């Protein structure tokens, strides 16, 4: 719907409305606990955290 | 002044819209 | 009040910036 998207939260199943610019992309589990975060495919606050 | 007041409201609304769109452009660039 | 002219000038500049930012959004989406 342009500005907003609906997501389901993995810990709840709850459906929530989130703004398209607050969603951040997620790295494949392939990059779990990478030693150097420069190697992350998606580099954003959520991925570094 | 009403003539100034309405234009100032439109200006602040356009500023808010620009500040919103800047988030989208920033995210698109970083992606 | 005389300030309406300067406020209108600022609004025109800010909307020109918004227009080029929207063009940048669409360009970045296509790229």
From Swiss-Prot, chain A:
The rodlike tail sequence is highly repetitive, showing cycles of a 28-residue repeat pattern composed of 4 heptapeptides, characteristic for alpha-helical coiled coils. In the kidney, expressed in the glomeruli. Also expressed in leukocytes. The lineage of its organism: Eukaryota, Metazoa, Chordata, Craniata, Vertebrata. It is found in: Cytoplasm, Cytoskeleton; Cytoplasm, Cell cortex; Cytoplasmic vesicle, Secretory vesicle, Cortical granule; Cell membrane. It is linked to Macrothrombocytopenia and granulocyte inclusions with or without nephritis or sensorineural hearing loss: An autosomal dominant disorder characterized by thrombocytopenia, giant platelets and Dohle body-like inclusions in peripheral blood leukocytes with variable ultrastructural appearance. Some affected individuals lack leukocyte inclusion bodies on classic staining of peripheral blood smears. Alport syndrome-like features of nephritis, hearing loss, and eye abnormalities are present in some patients. Deafness, autosomal dominant, 17: A form of deafness characterized by progressive high frequency hearing impairment and cochleosaccular degeneration. The chain holds residues 50 to 98 of 1960 of the full protein. It comes from Homo sapiens (Human). It comes from the Eukaryota. Belongs to the TRAFAC class myosin-kinesin ATPase superfamily. Myosin family. Myosin is a hexameric protein that consists of 2 heavy chain subunits (MHC), 2 alkali light chain subunits (MLC) and 2 regulatory light chain subunits (MLC-2). Interacts with RASIP1. Interacts with DDR1. Interacts with PDLIM2. Interacts with SVIL. Interacts with HTRA3. Interacts with Myo7a. Interacts with CFAP95. Interacts with LIMCH1; independently of the integration of MYH9 into the myosin complex. Interacts with RAB3A. Interacts with ZBED4. Interacts with S100A4; this interaction increases cell motility. This is Myosin-9. Cellular myosin that appears to play a role in cytokinesis, cell shape, and specialized functions such as secretion and capping. Required for cortical actin clearance prior to oocyte exocytosis. Promotes cell motility in conjunction with S100A4. During cell spreading, plays an important role in cytoskeleton reorganization, focal contact formation (in the margins but not the central part of spreading cells), and lamellipodial retraction; this function is mechanically antagonized by MYH10. (Microbial infection) Acts as a receptor for herpes simplex virus 1/HHV-1 envelope glycoprotein B. ISGylated. Ubiquitination.
């Amino acid at each position: 719907v342009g500005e907003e998207a609906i997501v389901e939260l993995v810990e709840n199943g709850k459906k929530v409305k989130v703004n398209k610019d607050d969603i951040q992309k997620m790295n494949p589990p392939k990059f779990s606990k990478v030693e150097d975060m420069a190697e992350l495919t998606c580099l954003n606050e959520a991925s570094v955290l | 002044q009403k003539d100034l007041e309405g234009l100032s409201q439109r200006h602040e609304e356009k500023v808010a819209a620009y500040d919103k769109l800047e988030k989208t452009k920033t995210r698109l660039q970083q992606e």
